[model samples]
Target: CLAEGTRIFDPVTGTTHRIEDVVDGRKPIHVVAAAKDGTLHARPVVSWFDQGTRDVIGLRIAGGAILWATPDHKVLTEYGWRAAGELRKGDRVAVRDVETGELRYSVIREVLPTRRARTFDLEVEELHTLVAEGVVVHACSP
Candidate 1:
């Protein structure tokens, strides 16, 4: 599950919309993706999940970007895809450098948990990955 207001960049429409919006619309079949260099990214967003309310955690990056997801949620890290709660300080995760428009991996600065949180997840068609607030993450829900 993911936090409310989490962003999902859809290159086809050339916009980054809230994860909730895509779920609400639930059409078009446009996908989510990961990116870098000349261009690296995939898939569409049409899957919606109501995981039920529960606790959630935040994975904070070096520059303060955060990805809030369930403890079992996975994000692309230097060590390959890893769960949010499993990530430790100093572990690096992929991020898009807005200034340079490049893919950069920034170290995890902090991991915080909120005892109260609603459960919701978004899944894409392919790549099975999404950049939440500029960080590459798994489109959780197996």
Candidate 2:
């Protein structure tokens, strides 16, 4: 649930603000709206906090596909973290050997775009070996 200090982005203004109070479940929330340009401002706005709220917030934001860096310093694009399994080739990614916690970088060497599959090729030999031996590959963001 959203609480005091919860940050929310305002797409129209491209600024982030924090929630100051919940008020009541049926009432508008008190938020510290971010100032645009050089002005300072804050206000109350009607909003909801729920499981699907984050997705809605992301959709409202203006930008290209969300990009994330991996622990090994490789960058990859994602449609939020929920859609990671759909990552495609030419995408930069990292590999971590589960047994040893070693990290490596690689690019998706090949991907069948139409299939939405995870079975793709990696360009780095170390990464390939790590994947073969079972590695944890997850998105890392700044």
Candidate 3:
């Protein structure tokens, strides 16, 4: 969704126009690339974006312009709120960067039990290269 009077460049059509005239509303959310469909799909990240309650909106990537918005209020409640057992052998685990202090997102090349692990190597470029680093494991067993 876009603001009722904002302009957007349609990469698909190679044309620029006002989002208000194209989409239904003025607020848009996560625009993910769907490899299966070979297209990009946008969805509001919050529940409120689905509901028309407030005038809160999101920013566009092109010009950082403000557009009309949907009401979204869902917030992250927990640090590890991902799907259970969703982590595969090779998954990205974002950790703090030692050099830059910025969040360094790395992948999990190997998965190992905590007790047997000796070192925690939290730096890897790709997810498939993650080996069982001796990093402290934060498991949610409760």
Best by TM-score: 1
Residue range 3-120, candidate 3, lDDT tens digits: 2443333333434444333334433322111122222222222211122223433322111222222222111112332321244344444332334423334444443321211111
lDDT of each: 0.72, 0.27, 0.26
TM-score of each: 0.82, 0.22, 0.26
Compare candidates 2 and 3 on lDDT and give the better one. 2
Tens-digit per-residue lDDT, 19-100, candidate 1: 6666666655454466423244556665787677777788888877777888888888888878888888889998766576
Best by lDDT: 1
TM-score, predicted candidate 2 vs. hidden true structure: 0.22
What local lDDT score does residue 22 receive in model 2, on the 0 to 100 scale? 28
Superposed model 3: Cα runs more than 4 Å off: 23-54, 58-63, 73-142
Inter-residue clash pairs, candidate 3: 2-26, 3-26, 48-71, 48-72, 49-71, 109-130, 110-130, 119-134, 120-134, 120-135
For residues 14-119, write the lDDT of model 2, one tens digit per residue.
3544423222243332322212121222244433332212210111111122222111222222322223334565554443322333443345554321211112
Whichever of 1 and 2 has more lDDT, that candidate is: 1
- Any runs in candidate 1 off by more than 4 Å, and if so which? 27-32, 35-39
TM-score of decoy 3: 0.26
